[PDB]
Amino acid sequence: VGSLNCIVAVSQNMGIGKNGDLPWPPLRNEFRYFQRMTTTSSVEGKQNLVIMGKKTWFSIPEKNRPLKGRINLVLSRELKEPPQGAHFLSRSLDDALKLTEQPELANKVDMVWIVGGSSVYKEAMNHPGHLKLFVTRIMQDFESDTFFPEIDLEKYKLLPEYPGVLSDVQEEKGIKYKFEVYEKND
Numbered sequence: 001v002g003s004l005n006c007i008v009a010v011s012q013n014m015g016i017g018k019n020g021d022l023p024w025p026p027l028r029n030e031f032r033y034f035q036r037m038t039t040t041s042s043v044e045g046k047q048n049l050v051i052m053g054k055k056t057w058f059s060i061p062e063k064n065r066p067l068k069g070r071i072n073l074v075l076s077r078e079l080k081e082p083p084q085g086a087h088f089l090s091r092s093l094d095d096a097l098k099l100t101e102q103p104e105l106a107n108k109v110d111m112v113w114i115v116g117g118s119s120v121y122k123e124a125m126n127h128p129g130h131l132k133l134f135v136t137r138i139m140q141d142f143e144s145d146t147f148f149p150e151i152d153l154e155k156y157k158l159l160p161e162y163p164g165v166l167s168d169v170q171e172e173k174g175i176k177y178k179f180e181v182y183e184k185n186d
Contacts, residue, residue, distance in 0.1 A: 001100045003048075003111035006124055007037055008148050009136035009177070015144015016118060020059055023142035029172045030136055033179065037134060039069045041110045047071055049105070051096050052115035057083060067115075071108060073099075075120045093123045122149045132183045139169070139176040156182040 009030055010016055015023050041047050050072045057065065057074045066072045066085040073088040073096055082089040088105075090096040097112065099105040114124045124131060133156065135148075161167050162181040169178045 001106060001109050004097075004114065004124060004127070004129070004131050005111060006114045006121055006131065006133040007034065007135075008116065008121065008133070009034075009138055010148045011138045011140070011142040011144060013141030013144065014147045015142060016116070016148045017055075017059070017146035018142070018144050020055055023144045024138055024175060025173055027172050027175060027177070029170065030177065033136070035067075038067070038113045038115065041069070043110055046108060046110040048111040048113055049073060049096075049100075049109040050113050050115050051075060051093065051120065053117045053120045054079070054083065056116040056120075057086065071105070093120060093127065118146055118149055125149065125152075128186050130183075130185050132181065134165070135180050135182070137178045137180050139178070151182060155184045155186065157184070159183055 008016060009022070011023050017023065038048060038050055048070055050067060050070050052072070052074060054074045054076045060067065066087060071087045073090060074083060074086045075093060075096060076089045077091045079089065088099065090099065100109055114120055125133070133151070159181045165179045165181055169176050171177070
């Protein structure tokens with residue numbers, strides 16, 4: 001049972017989405033960091049819980065979801081049901097973190113990762129304790145209909161490097177991006 005971690009890829013004009021798809025072309029290496037980051041479970045036999053919004057869920061290739069080696073929860077205020085492939089639903093992030101201690105999900109979950117979007121991010125970011133936001137800084141802005149909210153620097157610190165994260169600017173299919181890590185401990 002654990003760990004609130006926000007993982008996002010943003011363009012430079014901060015968009016995170018366009019027509020319920022991503023603004024940029026698909027970066028398969030961007031995706032693998034995505035995957036490695038959210039799958040790696042740290043104890044000898046539990047799993048990370050992934051919390052994302054229903055759009056975002058839909059947003060993933062029908063055949064990619066549920067995202068395997070991972071319990072996946074959709075934040076859904078409005079529906080009688082965890083969509084097919086979903087493992088759970090909760091009306092709020094907090095009912096999301098309560099199944100942790102729930103007999104429901106107590107002996108299962110290691111790390112908790114917010115996979116999106118903007119508004120579930122927006123809750124997380126504001127929430128107490130220890131948070132870690134992992135951001136892929138896409139270097140060229142694209143047209144987006146959604147944005148990633150604002151990093152209150154009075155609370156987030158840019159960490160100068162982080163074990164398992166490349167510092168170097170990456171570049172795939174013509175797009176430069178850097179992985180940057182932030183963190184707070186209220």
